[PDB]
Design a protein around this ligand. Structure first.
Ligand code: HEM
Ligand code: HEM
Ligand code: HEM
Ligand code: HEM
Lengths: 140, 143, 143, 140
């Protein structure tokens, strides 16, 4: 699916993210929780505060999973096997929620990489997040 | 929709700093790059093959300027969106035959463009207000 | 919706031969087999792991009988669906937090069950009328 | 994606279809045209009659493509390469239309195989038609 030019734009974009991955993933979860409130029902045990601790740690863990998905961009069904067994069997997340977070991730990158977010990078990152969302629902 | 008056102050306050020409054609051009099947609806606009000729096509710029004309009319009429977009829902759902999912896509693309032009000025409550606006315009064009 | 009176005769004439108990629980059980994420909403119904224990779960059959109760109320009130399903759109969108895409899925599953119980009696105009009904019920629960 | 039990149900179901593939694909296109009328805009050169000739021949050609997708159930991106270049580049079909036809295909099978259409066969054929719809949009 992903062309090597798209993998160039994805690896370049997360390369420009770098060490701010926990802040961007925490930002994206705050955007999903505050704009799309039904996803708050998947987290009945967190404190979903505007700058909380479990939202920031879970944002760091989501973005570490996305970084390992970037480094395994052609090995996604095997590098995301425990997560796809987590989100599909144990948590049973509706797949359209994986669209919503994907959108918020793009908004986060568009709010924090205003030079690197060209429409080729937007299209490549949208293919990437739709591919990660495809792997995370692939046990359905 | 039903924006709280603080969210009306964030929608209005952020929308008062929106350049029309860049945000409109940039949003429509990012539809035609990110979601290429939408390019079957704009077959008269000349070249839409390469993304740089999508983002430099003058008809995409002027037509996107019309699209932000419609979003501006949607922000001056937040209560009567079903009344405002009736001609445009007739035009998109009776003449053009656009599947309403696509409207949602353009709305999300517009929100990305807003983040791309405002950064830290585009907070999660401002985005939540604009997702209420975007879903209001998309549901208003869905008739 | 706006069914033509021939399509009202096909909706009413076909729905008068619908067994309640088989079609309701069969439709909901085919949600829980075909679309397994919907099983997160029915965590109190005991076993929903294997498809035979989905299609033999008594709570799925009784709850599906309630669902065809609501579709029957939707067919007696084809003009006032927004008025009829207001309590159920409040229950599904405020208490249960169901993303409205799922309602569309159940509607399509119901149509499959109708074909599975009528065969050549379920023509493309009858199906077109039931897709208008199904989209009316799904959009009526979308509030 | 498709388990060997799902491939068993798909190959068994199209095995029970057999020679009626042109009638079932023509039936499914008549259901998509009559119930979901915007898909009629993809066919501006056909006679979309209730039992026409180009609708029946195109139904036979769609169902021959589906039968070659059944016989190549684990070789779908290479056995459906010309069609995925057709529907994505040349025709530019909205992917949600590939959902609609998939639905009508199930309805057609449910209207014509009332014994073989168990919920495991319904789930397997839904995974199959979502996989064929995934291949036919994979050049996006
Ligand atoms: C591209 C999208 C996503 C990625 C990469 C991702 C990644 C992760 C990771 C790394 C974990 C923690 C696993 C561990 O404990 O080691 C996790 C768990 C979880 N995810 Fe996701 N996730 C994604 C999307 C979503 C979405 C869209 C939702 C809900 C609407 C969601 C809900 C959850 C929940 C509830 C947990 C359980 C962890 C807890 O609550 O303690 N995830 N995911
Ligand atoms: C919230 C979403 C949208 C809004 C507010 C909007 C608004 C408009 C407006 C103002 C016009 C011009 C009407 C006129 O000049 O009389 C228009 C026309 C049009 N729209 Fe949209 N639109 C939206 C979404 C879309 C999408 C998503 C597509 C395609 C995938 C689309 C395709 C078209 C086309 C092809 C035309 C006609 C072009 C022409 O007349 O030259 N629209 N829309
Ligand atoms: C699209 C048409 C639908 C109709 C007409 C419908 C009908 C109903 C009705 C009448 C009730 C009330 C039951 C009662 O008061 O005892 C109910 C409850 C419920 N519905 Fe639906 N429903 C639909 C879609 C869905 C879908 C798609 C899901 C899940 C994916 C769902 C999940 C539930 C749940 C979890 C309950 C509560 C169960 C309980 O109270 O024991 N519904 N529905
Ligand atoms: C879901 C599985 C589908 C399959 C297996 C399929 C298969 C085919 C085949 C075999 C052809 C003939 C091309 C050739 O022989 O090389 C074709 C053409 C075409 N298909 Fe599909 N198709 C599917 C879905 C759709 C959908 C959902 C639409 C539109 C809403 C569509 C629209 C068209 C059009 C417009 C043509 C061109 C007709 C012509 O050239 O006369 N197809 N497809």
């Amino acid at each position: 699916v992903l062309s090597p030019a798209d993998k160039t734009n994805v690896k370049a974009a997360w390369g420009k993210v770098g060490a701010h991955a926990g802040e961007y993933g925490a930002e994206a979860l705050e955007r999903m929780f505050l704009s799309f409130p039904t996803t708050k029902t998947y987290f009945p045990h967190f404190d979903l505060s505007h700058g909380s601790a479990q939202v920031k740690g879970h944002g760091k863990k989501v973005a570490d999973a996305l970084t390992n998905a970037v480094a395994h961009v052609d090995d996604m069904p095997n590098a995301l096997s425990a997560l796809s067994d987590l989100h599909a069997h144990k948590l049973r997340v509706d797949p359209v929620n994986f669209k919503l977070l994907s959108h918020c991730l793009l908004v986060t990158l568009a709010a924090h990489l205003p030079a690197e977010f060209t429409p080729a990078v937007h299209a490549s990152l949208d293919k990437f997040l739709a591919s990660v969302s495809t792997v995370l629902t692939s046990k359905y | 929709v039903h924006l709280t008056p603080e969210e009306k102050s964030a929608v209005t306050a952020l929308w008062g700093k929106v350049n029309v020409d860049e945000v409109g054609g940039e949003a429509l051009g990012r539809l035609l790059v990110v979601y290429p099947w939408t390019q079957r609806f704009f077959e008269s606009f000349g070249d839409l093959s390469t993304p740089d000729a999508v983002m430099g096509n003058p008809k995409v710029k002027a037509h996107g300027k019309k699209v932000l004309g419609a979003f501006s009319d949607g922000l001056a009429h937040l209560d009567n969106l079903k009344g405002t977009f009736a001609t445009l829902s007739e035009l998109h759902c009776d003449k053009l035959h656009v599947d309403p999912e696509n409207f949602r896509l353009l709305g999300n693309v517009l929100v990305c463009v807003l983040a791309h032009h405002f950064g830290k000025e585009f907070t999660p409550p401002v985005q939540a207000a604009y997702q209420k606006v975007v879903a209001g315009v998309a549901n208003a064009l869905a008739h």
